[PDB]
Design a protein around this ligand. Structure first.
Ligand SMILES: CCCCCCCCCCCCCCCCCC(=O)OC[C@H](COP(=O)([O-])OCC(O)COP(=O)([O-])OC[C@@H](COC(=O)CCCCCCCCCCCCCCCCC)OC(=O)CCCCCCCCCCCCCCCCC)OC(=O)CCCCCCCCCCCCCCCCC
Ligand SMILES: CCCCCCCCCCCCCCCCCC(=O)OC[C@H](COP(=O)([O-])OCC(O)COP(=O)([O-])OC[C@@H](COC(=O)CCCCCCCCCCCCCCCCC)OC(=O)CCCCCCCCCCCCCCCCC)OC(=O)CCCCCCCCCCCCCCCCC
Ligand SMILES: CCCCCCCCCCCCCCCCCC(=O)OC[C@H](COP(=O)([O-])OCC(O)COP(=O)([O-])OC[C@@H](COC(=O)CCCCCCCCCCCCCCCCC)OC(=O)CCCCCCCCCCCCCCCCC)OC(=O)CCCCCCCCCCCCCCCCC
Ligand SMILES: CCCCCCCCCCCCCCCCCC(=O)OC[C@H](COP(=O)([O-])OCC(O)COP(=O)([O-])OC[C@@H](COC(=O)CCCCCCCCCCCCCCCCC)OC(=O)CCCCCCCCCCCCCCCCC)OC(=O)CCCCCCCCCCCCCCCCC
Ligand SMILES: CCCCCCCCCCCCCCCCCC(=O)OC[C@H](COP(=O)([O-])OCC(O)COP(=O)([O-])OC[C@@H](COC(=O)CCCCCCCCCCCCCCCCC)OC(=O)CCCCCCCCCCCCCCCCC)OC(=O)CCCCCCCCCCCCCCCCC
Ligand SMILES: CCCCCCCCCCCCCCCCCC(=O)OC[C@H](COP(=O)([O-])OCC[N+](C)(C)C)OC(=O)CCCCCCCCCCCCCCCCC
Ligand SMILES: CCCCCCCCCCCCCCCCCC(=O)OC[C@H](COP(=O)(O)OCCN)OC(=O)CCCCCCCCCCCCCCCCC
Ligand code: SF4
Ligand code: F3S
Ligand code: FES
Ligand SMILES: [Ca+2]
Lengths: 59, 285, 196, 103, 43, 44, 62, 93, 70, 74
């Protein structure tokens, strides 16, 4: 059975003010949350790094 | 006999996606034997064409050059001129011709609307693109599958239910002109599904979240004074994300060709649902 | 027997209190759909639903000491125990129907991910035999359930409206060629007409 | 997929389902899961709290339900302050003890 | 309808969120090893 | 907050649709327990 | 062969996204962190950004 | 009051011998989708909560340490070690 | 202290001692820069105010102290 | 978009027990007792300490096998 397909609306709909206005607030909140979580993850990541070792040192 | 094909499918999918991105908006001229001097006097219509019945056919725009001085200035009129004169194999739904049935709802040059009561850019330079509704399965050309929409409409019980018998059976359910103006501007929906097909939430959750049109019909049946299943309808629509998924984009109201306000109806429905949830606790005590 | 007295008092109190609520809990479960029959209890208000679920097993299993029970008290306790057993059976039935619904929804989700726009890596033009057979068997089982639910019109109507929605979506998700008539032979009898 | 791999996959999924069903429905395991589920429900939905819906008239509401927040705040503050004072007293006692022991 | 100690509940939730974010992000407790090259010296 | 996060993930990610409300509630309970443990331990 | 129909310059997903997303994602981050980050950094340095050298940096071996 | 007559009827009267066979493959697929979205998504958060305190407060996880003193052994070209148990504590604030 | 990188030990008579001194002097500059950075961070965090500082300086900056010791 | 942020408690967890308000005082007493015990132990361990460094504080080292630890000058 040949599966049916569709054309995504957002790929063929002219840009409208409503989309921009709503997605602006959505992206503001998303950016706030992502920035907080990314700051936490960055603090976790950098603090996990090892200490600098000598030159040409084994173990 | 068959065997695992995950690798072949993945490679084919990636390659096809890349090639489609490179060759997006694939266009085929209906009549390549046209001079540019002649094309100067004719407007260009890029009509989406696709025949899943034929295994050899794939989606594609077809470019038709037509004289706009031969038919009335409407998308449906142009489509029917193209069908009757150029290629009668084109498919499209049309019943009323005057924007009442709502069958001709298509993506008329980037905006969902009825093709019978929508004009097109008279300028001969800018082409006009005609495609079916976006997030609806395409059956053929400009025909989509609205069966899911019809089932969602069925799921709301759109019929007057009354728990109190009529006092005399020789009269009509009383309803004041104010209670009728309450329904005025709300029962005119023709179920053309443009607002639902433009609603972002409906794109993401076609099934779990009911369309703005269906929710507006539910709001109409709720605000109707004659019906008595107000709380019952509110509770039924308050399930899961049937209404909660709506994010108040307003594109439904913006696109509604009839001038209705499904956004306002949804806002009122949300207010009533919140009040119902609060008073289910406040009242019963 | 102080320990026996305390045990019997606890059992009586809990069993009777939850028997007085089993009607409401079962009504809410019936009102809710099969995707998450306990959705209302999990999200809005847990109307002794977890209490009923927990104490049904205790009512079924834990013994009784009639000498610590009265006549009307013993009769009421027996009635509450029967009510709790009925609630347990109802919950089992609802769970079975919910799991069948989620099987059909899993099939539908598998189809949807195939046609998802973001699916730039697993785009398949032709449906495969494994999923075709899964759809056929699932539809056969759904038809069998509909037949078995002939004596309960409300249950049959709810089962249709809830489960068959995804069957209709699967029907719409594919073209009408290949093995489609054989796959949806049973569905086309009645179920297809309903979802139009 | 290949039919042989289909046989293998069907056997594997059937084994997984049977194992899960047996582990969940086994007598002792079933009882453990049931009691643990009710216990988790009690812990999550009936944890100690300071704010609750008051559905009783001032005549039918106890004074404990009106002064519980104040009692809890007093207990916590007194515990913290007493611990701080005990820390100071222990510091002083240790200092004096070791000073008198030597230097 | 009345909620006992609703203001206390709001303040407790706000304090819990503030403390959780404080400990998770260590926003107040930054690192200045990066600033050390860009600082003067005494003695 | 947690409800909003789960709602966004469910509405945007197709694969997340598999999880039930029961599974979402179990994740909620685990997250609350972990947050309480974090708050308690940070002061220890 | 996947054929995609998409208005790159006019559809909501495209150049409008490029113009919209960067200025909206960074609304709270900038306006909040920059003042808050500046406050956190500067409150330490009431007197100055002086590194009190606990080690003899000015001393070099003969 | 809500007109819950049909739901009350359904609750009172339900079949007690009807059951549906479940596709083991699909049930396993859904359960492992849940397991995937549990491990690969929630384990990040759980491990963060579990370990970040251990990264920013390591001294509380290692209570006791050892210290060594060495003396030479010339006639045998050996090194003699004397150990000592100490309470792991901060040093050089 | 800016120690020189040329060890003053006699390699002919004390080879291991000379090698140890040479390696120590070679890595001393880098490790001293790291130690100075860590100490500066610690002292500034201590100079911080209230929750941003002194109130929880010794007990919560444990990884920094461990890194300094290492 | 829809505004959803709020500090108000959810009605799902605001229920009371049958006998009155939730068990707050009892759990507060238990927590106070636990905190008292924990902080008392911590204070007792922390404050009564001294570091004695002398010959008697050192003992002969040994491997995990129990033998004395000696390293050759290889
Ligand atoms: C598409 C391809 C793109 C490729 C990208 C490649 C990028 C490679 C980067 C390499 C690593 C860089 C690390 C820099 C760290 C900076 C901190 C620092 O120096 O600290 C010293 C660092 C230790 O840091 P720490 O002190 O412990 O703490 C650091 C924390 O950041 C805490 O520090 P802090 O508290 O001081 O932080 C300052 C504060 C400051 O915060 C604020 O206040 C924010 C202010 C922002 C202002 C923005 C203004 C912009 C203006 C916009 C204008 C628009 C107008 C529009 C107009 C429209 C019209 C109207 O916080 C932040 O800075 C916020 C950080 C959190 C980020 C949140 C988001 C994370 C997720 C998203 C990531 C990006 C995805 C992009 C996707 C693109 C797709 C297309 O130690 C060092 O000395 C290391 C130096 C750095 C090098 C590390 C090398 C590690 C190598 C690992 C191996 C793997 C490498 C692979 C490389 C791959 C390359 C291709
Ligand atoms: C490392 C840390 C560990 C600790 C921290 C843990 C934290 C995490 C949470 C853990 C959650 C998971 C727990 C594991 C699952 C347990 C499953 C289980 O028990 O399996 C039995 C269950 C079998 O029972 P069944 O099938 O449900 O019942 C029918 C059987 O024929 C049996 O027929 P039957 O009638 O002959 O026997 C019925 C009953 C034996 O019946 C009796 O003999 C009487 C028992 C007492 C009944 C309740 C009277 C209450 C009176 C008031 C008390 C007030 C106190 C003061 C407060 C006043 C103010 C409020 O036997 C049971 O089944 C006992 C089940 C457990 C206790 C149930 C009672 C709960 C309420 C009372 C305790 C809590 C205090 C509440 C206070 C407030 C009340 C308003 O399944 C198994 O056989 C599995 C066995 C293998 C699994 C491991 C077994 C471990 C056994 C532990 C026994 C503990 C006894 C209580 C100790 C109390 C010491 C202070
Ligand atoms: C096998 C079983 C199944 C396992 C499943 C897997 C997961 C594990 C499950 C295990 C079960 C336990 C899980 C934890 C409970 C989860 C609760 C939950 O999710 O509820 C959500 C649910 C969220 O609802 P919501 O609508 O979002 O409302 C929350 C808002 O925050 C609204 O909050 P709120 O407004 O109601 O606030 C809460 C209330 C709660 O408070 C209480 O009543 C609690 C108090 C603490 C008592 C602690 C008792 C501890 C006893 C321990 C005993 C030893 C145990 C040993 C065990 C050994 C094993 C046998 O707090 C207060 O009253 C605030 C007190 C603030 C004091 C302020 C001090 C000021 C001092 C100054 C005075 C004035 C001076 C003026 C000077 C003037 C100068 C000018 O929470 C609640 O409603 C309840 C409140 C939250 C309670 C948190 C409890 C966490 C407990 C963690 C224990 C971890 C132990 C681990 C042991 C490990 C051993 C190896
Ligand atoms: C350094 C520290 C260590 C870092 C690594 C830590 C990893 C921890 C464990 C992660 C476990 C994740 C898997 C479990 C979650 C649930 C997944 C699931 O539903 O499974 C089924 C679902 C597959 O469903 P399906 O049926 O096959 O797909 C069709 C359905 O329609 C599909 O429907 P749908 O909507 O449900 O599917 C969406 C699916 C997404 O799946 C897709 O539909 C496509 C995925 C690939 C997208 C590739 C980009 C496409 C073009 C976009 C534009 C980019 C332009 C760049 C150039 C700009 C220049 C200016 O979304 C997800 O996978 C959700 C979770 C994603 C976040 C967690 C994973 C992060 C991995 C990051 C590392 C990746 C490897 C290194 C790559 C770099 C090497 C140089 O996901 C998978 O099985 C795949 C999992 C993802 C694999 C990796 C793909 C790359 C992702 C990159 C994200 C970058 C974010 C930026 C921050 C990164 C910081 C590290
Ligand atoms: C302390 C150290 C030792 C701890 C030992 C823990 C042992 C736990 C083992 C659990 C075994 C399975 C239990 C199965 C259920 C059987 C009992 C039953 O059905 O309930 C009957 C009885 C009443 O149930 P019901 O009739 O169904 O009522 C509920 C209906 O909604 C009807 O409601 P209603 O409106 O009609 O009102 C009835 C009211 C009736 O309530 C009562 O009557 C109970 C009121 C409280 C106790 C009153 C008596 C106090 C004095 C006791 C003296 C005992 C001395 C023992 C002597 C032993 C010497 C050998 O019910 C309630 O309100 C229930 C209260 C539930 C409290 C939940 C607490 C969760 C938070 C715990 C952690 C807190 C940490 C905070 C840290 C924060 C720091 C900042 O309920 C209880 O016994 C409550 C038990 C709740 C606690 C169990 C879970 C504890 C887990 C703690 C965390 C451990 C995590 C460690 C890591 C995990 C791996 C190890
Ligand atoms: C360490 C690794 C780092 C890697 C970084 C990778 C970054 C990935 C960023 C992804 C952004 C989001 C899109 C993908 C995920 C979408 C998930 C989702 O929910 O969507 C589902 C939906 C799609 O599904 P749908 O629309 O069918 O909805 C589902 C509907 N049902 C349920 C009925 C099936 O949305 C999309 O996927 C939208 C995709 C938009 C793609 C836009 C591509 C823009 C490319 C710009 C290139 C610019 C180049 C400039 C060069 C300049 C040179 C000078
Ligand atoms: C938005 C949604 C998604 C969000 C995701 C969120 C994720 C949260 C994760 C939380 C946990 C964080 C854990 C961080 C671990 C970091 C480890 C690391 O890479 O460290 C860097 C390390 C060098 O660091 P270090 O040794 O300390 O040296 C510098 C000292 N000054 O570098 C090394 O040692 C290098 C070697 C180790 C790393 C190997 C990585 C292999 C990657 C294989 C990819 C395979 C798939 C490829 C797919 C594409 C194929 C075409
Ligand atoms: S509300 Fe308007 S756009 Fe939506 S279906 Fe009705 S008439 Fe069409
Ligand atoms: S378009 Fe979509 S989500 Fe809300 S108001 Fe209008 S419906
Ligand atoms: S022709 Fe009737 S709606 Fe357009
Ligand atoms: Ca009404």
């Amino acid at each position: 059975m040949r599966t049916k397909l569709y054309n995504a609306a957002y790929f063929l709909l002219n840009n409208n003010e409503s989309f921009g206005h709503s997605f602006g607030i959505r992206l503001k909140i998303v950016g706030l949350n992502t920035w907080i979580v990314g700051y936490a993850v960055s603090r976790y990541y950098f603090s996990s790094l090892r200490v600098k070792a000598a030159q040409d040192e084994r173990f | 006999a068959e065997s695992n094909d995950a690798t072949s499918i993945c490679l084919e999918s990636i390659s096809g996606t890349i090639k489609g991105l490179q060759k997006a908006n694939y266009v085929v001229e209906h009549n390549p034997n046209l001079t540019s001097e002649e094309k100067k006097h004719l407007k260009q219509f890029l009509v989406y064409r696709y025949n899943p019945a034929d295994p050899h056919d794939q989606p594609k725009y077809v470019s038709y050059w037509c004289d706009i001085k031969k038919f009335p200035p409407m998308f449906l009129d142009a489509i029917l001129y193209i069908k009757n004169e150029l290629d009668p194999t084109l498919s499209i739904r049309r019943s009323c011709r005057e924007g009442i049935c709502g069958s001709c709802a298509v993506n008329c040059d980037g905006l969902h609307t009825l093709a019978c009561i929508s004009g097109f850019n008279r300028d001969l330079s800018k082409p006009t693109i005609i495609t079916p509704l976006g997030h609806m399965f395409i059956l053929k050309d400009l025909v989509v599958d609205m069966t899911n929409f019809y089932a969602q409409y069925k799921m709301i019980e759109p019929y007057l239910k009354r728990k109190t018998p009529k006092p005399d059976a020789n009269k009509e359910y009383p309803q004041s002109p104010e209670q009728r103006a309450l329904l005025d501007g709300l029962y005119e929906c023709v179920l053309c599904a443009a607002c639902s097909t433009s609603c972002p939430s409906y794109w993401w959750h076609p099934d779990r979240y009911l369309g703005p049109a269906i929710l507006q019909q539910a709001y109409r049946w709720i605000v109707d004074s004659r019906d008595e299943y107000t709380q019952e309808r509110i509770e039924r629509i308050a399930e899961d994300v049937r209404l909660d998924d709506c994010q108040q984009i307003g594109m439904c109201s913006f696109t509604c060709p009839k001038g209705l306000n499904p956004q306002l109806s949804l806002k009122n429905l949300m207010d009533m649902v919140k009040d119902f949830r609060q008073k289910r606790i406040e009242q019963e005590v | 027997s102080l320990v026996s007295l305390f045990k019997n008092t606890f059992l009586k109190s809990r069993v009777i209190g939850l028997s007085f609520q089993a009607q409401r809990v079962m009504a809410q479960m019936a009102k809710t759909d099969f995707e998450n029959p306990d959705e209302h209890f999990l999200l809005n208000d847990a109307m002794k639903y977890n209490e009923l679920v927990f104490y049904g097993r205790l009512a079924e299993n834990w013994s009784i000491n009639p000498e610590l029970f009265g006549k009307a008290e013993l009769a009421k306790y027996n009635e509450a125990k029967q009510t709790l057993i009925d609630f347990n059976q109802y919950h089992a039935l609802v769970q079975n129907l919910h799991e069948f619904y989620w099987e059909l929804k899993t099939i539908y989700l598998e189809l949807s991910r195939g046609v998802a726009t973001s699916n730039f890596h697993n785009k398949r033009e032709v449906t495969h035999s494994i999923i075709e057979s899964d759809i056929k068997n699932s539809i056969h089982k759904y038809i069998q359930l509909i037949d078995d639910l002939k004596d309960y019109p409300e249950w049959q109507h709810k089962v249709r409206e809830e489960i068959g929605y995804y069957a209709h979506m699967i029907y719409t998700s594919v073209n009408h060629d290949g093995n489609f008539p054989e796959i949806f032979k049973e569905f086309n009898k009645v179920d297809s007409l309903y979802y139009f | 997929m290949n039919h042989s791999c289909q046989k293998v996959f069907e056997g594997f999924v059937s084994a997984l389902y049977d194992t899960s069903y047996f582990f969940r429905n086994f007598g002792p395991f079933k009882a453990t899961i049931h009691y643990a589920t009710y216990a988790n429900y009690l812990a999550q939905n009936w944890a100690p709290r300071v704010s609750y819906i008051e559905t009783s008239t001032p005549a039918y509401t106890l004074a404990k339900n009106k002064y519980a927040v104040y009692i809890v705040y007093g207990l916590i503050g007194g515990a913290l302050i007493h611990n701080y004072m005990l820390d100071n007293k222990a510091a002083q006692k240790s200092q004096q003890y070791y000073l008198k022991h030597r230097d | 309808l009345p909620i006992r100690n609703i203001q206390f509940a709001r303040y407790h939730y706000l304090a819990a969120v503030t403390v959780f974010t404080y400990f998770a992000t260590r926003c107040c407790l930054l690192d200045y090893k990066k600033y050390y090259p860009l600082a003067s010296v005494k003695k | 907050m947690f409800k909003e996060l789960i709602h966004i993930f469910r509405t945007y990610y197709i694969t997340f649709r598999y999880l039930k409300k029961s599974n979402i509630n179990f994740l909620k309970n685990l997250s609350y327990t972990l947050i309480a443990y974090y708050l308690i331990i940070n002061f220890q | 062969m996947r054929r995609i129909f998409w208005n790159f310059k006019t559809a909501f997903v495209g150049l409008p996204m490029f113009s919209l997303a960067p200025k909206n994602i960074l609304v709270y981050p900038i306006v909040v962190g920059v003042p808050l980050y500046t406050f956190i950094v500067l409150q330490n340095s009431v007197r100055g950004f002086a590194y009190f050298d606990e080690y003899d940096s000015d001393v070099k071996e003969n | 009051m809500l007109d819950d007559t049909k739901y009350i009827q359904m609750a009172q009267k339900f079949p007690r011998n009807v059951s549906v066979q479940l596709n083991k493959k699909l049930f396993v697929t859904r359960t492992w989708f849940r397991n995937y979205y549990f491990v690969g998504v929630f384990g990040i958060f759980a491990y963060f909560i579990y370990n970040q305190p251990k990264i920013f407060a390591p001294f509380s996880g290692y209570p006791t340490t050892v210290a060594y003193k060495a003396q030479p052994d010339f006639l045998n070209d050996q090194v003699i070690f004397y150990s000592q148990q100490r309470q792991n504590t901060l040093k050089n604030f | 202290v800016r120690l020189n990188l040329k060890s003053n030990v006699d390699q002919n008579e004390y080879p291991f001692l000379a090698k140890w001194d040479k390696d120590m002097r070679q890595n001393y500059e880098e490790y001293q820069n790291r130690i100075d950075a860590t100490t500066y961070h610690l002292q500034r965090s201590q100079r911080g105010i209230a929750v941003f500082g002194e109130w929880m300086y010794p007990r919560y900056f444990q990884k920094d102290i461990l890194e300094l010791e290492v | 978009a829809r505004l959803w942020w709020t500090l108000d408690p959810s009605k799902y967890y605001l229920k009371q027990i049958s006998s009155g308000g939730r068990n707050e005082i009892l759990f507060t007493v238990l927590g106070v007792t636990a905190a008292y015990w924990y902080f008392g132990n911590k204070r007792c361990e922390h404050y009564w300490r001294r570091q004695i460094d002398n010959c008697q504080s050192w003992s002969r080292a040994q491997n995990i096998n129990g033998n004395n630890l000696t390293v050759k000058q290889y």
